[PDB]
Paper text:
A family of artificial proteins, named αRep, based on a natural family of helical repeat was previously designed. αRep members are efficiently expressed, folded and extremely stable proteins. A large αRep library was constructed creating proteins with a randomized interaction surface. From this library, we selected by phage display αRep binders with nanomolar dissociation constants against the GFP. The structures of two independent αRep binders in complex with the GFP target were solved by X-ray crystallography revealing two totally different binding modes.
bGFP-A–EGFP (complex 1) crystallized in the monoclinic space-group P21 and crystals diffracted at 2 Å resolution. The asymmetric unit contains one copy of the hetero-dimer. Clear electron density was observed for residues 3–231 of the EGFP and 15–259 of the bGFP-A αRep. bGFP-A consists of 16 α-helices, which superposed well with the last 12 helices of a previously described αRep-4 structure (RMSD value of 0.367 Å for 168 atoms superimposed). In complex 1 the helices of bGFP-A are oriented perpendicularly to the barrel axis of EGFP, whereas, for complex 2, the helices of bGFP-C are parallel with the barrel axis. The majority of the direct protein contacts between bGFP-A and EGFP surface are located at the N-cap helices of the repeat protein. The curvature of bGFP-A creates a cavity between the EGFP barrel surface and its central repeats (R5 and R6) that is filled with water molecules that mediate indirect protein interactions. The direct interactions between bGFP-A and EGFP are mainly hydrophobic and mediated by randomized residues on the concave surface of the proteins. However, only 14 out of the 42 randomized residues are involved in the interaction. A more detailed analysis of the interfaces between the αRep proteins and EGFP revealed that different types of interactions stabilize the complexes. The thermodynamic parameters of binding obtained by ITC are presented in Figure 5, showing that both binders have compensating differences in their enthalpic and entropic contributions. bGFP-A, has an unfavourable ∆H [5.58±0.06 kcal·mol−1 (1 cal≡4.184 J)] and a favourable negative −T∆S (−16.33 kcal·mol−1) contribution. The extended concave surface of bGFP-A is sufficiently large to accommodate the cylindrical shape of EGFP with an unexpected orientation, interacting with one end of the cylinder as well as with side chains located along the side of the barrel.
Author numbering:
A (entry chain C): 15 to 259
B (entry chain A): 3 to 64, 68 to 231
Write the structure that this text describes.
């Protein structure tokens, strides 16, 4: 059957090739890596997209250079599937080519590259991702924030504190989760302020970010907040002081 | 007629009116479908402000007539066979450990345009659950949609589970139970048991400041031998 789909990858009709490629990514068998790399150059963009999608799903590092190359495809969906595929494979060789894709014309391609860079977890992405925090597109900024959170590098702490004031609630929200994930205590006071944010979800995430940071600094900020804070912020603190000792 | 209407790229319109735990909303979609590729390209906007549920929870509600049936399976394509008068699609969707949606839609040609019109009601959702607390990731999995002939009436029964990624790394399940019945008289194909295998990518439009979802979808029928 994996035999059959590999065979259908060669069919005259692009649709047949398209669903051969998808099917093979689903089955997950290594035999299909080679013929799927071939399909990455199919003249049909849907085939190229399916092939790239499947290669990400198979997880095999032999597809890494072929996919780095698909980062240059004329089709933005193909380029998107290429970046996602390289994140999923996790091979460090993808890092500098995805760093470049952070400057792609298509913001969803930029976004996907930033996601993929968080998934790899490689330190080299930290600075370019810090720059992507100032991307024009709020989806990119959000995703850059979330990727820095997952990389966990201390250099992002101050830029993320700033993002906590971004005009878009969704960036502020991802900046708060990321600060929690990094665990650096510089985030405590800024996070305490974000408990005042207008957006309820920003508020809740800044609350759990503080729970994750923990330690004496959060404890003392909460003793103080349970005295001069109001609203959600005060409940967060009284709740914290209860559960934590 | 049926499959004949689908031989090229057909334009699509989608209209949804929903009310979930009392929050009313609407969504309008526009785009196109190419059944030869089982391909959909669409953009959806919430026309009433912010969407009170996550966009991925609405993907299945928001045109299975654009699925690719392979040549040997054409006698199992109920969806296209009902056209142009179209069909009624009804679901109940159970979000595990949370509320449910019930939906009713009509899918039909209105002029040269395939149009999906839907009404959705959902209740018993948890205020800070995954749905209403917006904890779902902005992505979409690959699924198998199981289809069987409706023994009683001209129509089909359909069942599947949608897997929704949650941002903490767990998965939320949405059990779909579906029924489709034709609108018109024109007789319909009542198919052998089979399934559709789906693929979906969600994105955004960088020029769009409204709450919206861009969608690319690939679906093929499968599981009939040859």
């Amino acid at each position: 059957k994996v035999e059959m789909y590999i065979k259908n990858l060669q069919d005259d009709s692009p649709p047949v090739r398209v669903y051969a490629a998808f099917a093979l990514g689903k089955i997950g068998d290594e035999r299909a890596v080679e013929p799927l790399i071939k399909a990455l150059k199919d003249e049909d963009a849907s085939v190229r997209y399916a092939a790239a999608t499947a290669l990400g799903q198979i997880g095999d590092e032999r597809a890494v250079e072929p996919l780095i190359k698909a980062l240059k495809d004329e089709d933005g969906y193909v380029r998107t599937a290429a970046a996602e595929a390289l994140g999923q494979i996790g091979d460090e060789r993808a890092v500098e080519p995805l760093i470049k894709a952070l400057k792609d014309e298509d913001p969803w391609v930029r976004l996907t590259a930033a996601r993929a860079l968080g998934e790899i977890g490689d330190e080299r992405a930290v600075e370019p991702l810090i720059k992507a925090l100032k991307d024009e597109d709020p989806w990119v900024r959000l995703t850059a924030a979330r990727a820095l959170g997952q990389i966990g590098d201390e250099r992002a702490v101050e830029p993320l504190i700033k993002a906590l004031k971004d005009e878009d609630a969704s960036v502020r929200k991802a900046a708060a989760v990321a600060l929690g994930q990094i665990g650096d205590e510089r985030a405590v006071e800024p996070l305490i302020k974000a408990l005042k944010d207008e957006d309820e979800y920003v508020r809740q995430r800044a609350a759990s970010a503080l729970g994750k940071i923990g330690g004496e600094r959060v404890r003392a900020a909460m003793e103080k907040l349970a005295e001069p804070a109001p609203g959600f912020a005060r409940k967060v603190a009284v709740n914290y002081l209860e559960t934590h000792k | 007629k049926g499959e004949e209407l689908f031989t090229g790229v057909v334009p699509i319109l989608v209209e949804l009116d929903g009310d979930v735990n009392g929050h009313k909303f609407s969504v309008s979609g526009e785009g196109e479908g190419d059944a030869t590729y089982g391909k959909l390209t669409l953009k959806f906007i919430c026309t009433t402000g912010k969407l009170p549920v996550p966009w991925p929870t609405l993907v299945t509600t928001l045109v299975q007539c654009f699925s690719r049936y392979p040549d040997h399976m054409k006698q199992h394509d109920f969806f296209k066979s009902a056209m142009p008068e179209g069909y009624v699609q009804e679901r109940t969707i159970f979000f595990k450990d949370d509320g449910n949606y019930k939906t009713r839609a009509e899918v039909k040609f209105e002029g040269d345009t395939l149009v999906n019109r839907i009404e959705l009601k959902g209740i018993d959702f948890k205020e800070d659950g995954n749905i209403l607390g917006h904890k779902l990731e902005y992505n979409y999995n690959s699924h198998n949609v199981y289809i069987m002939a409706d023994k009683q009436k001209n129509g089909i029964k359909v069942n599947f589970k949608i897997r929704h990624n949650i941002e903490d790394g767990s998965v939320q399940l949405a059990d779909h139970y579906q029924q489709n019945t034709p609108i018109g008289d024109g007789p319909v194909l009542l198919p052998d048991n089979h399934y559709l295998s789906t693929q979906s990518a969600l994105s955004k439009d960088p020029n769009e400041k409204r709450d919206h979802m861009v969608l690319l979808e690939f679906v093929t029928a499968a599981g009939i031998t040859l």
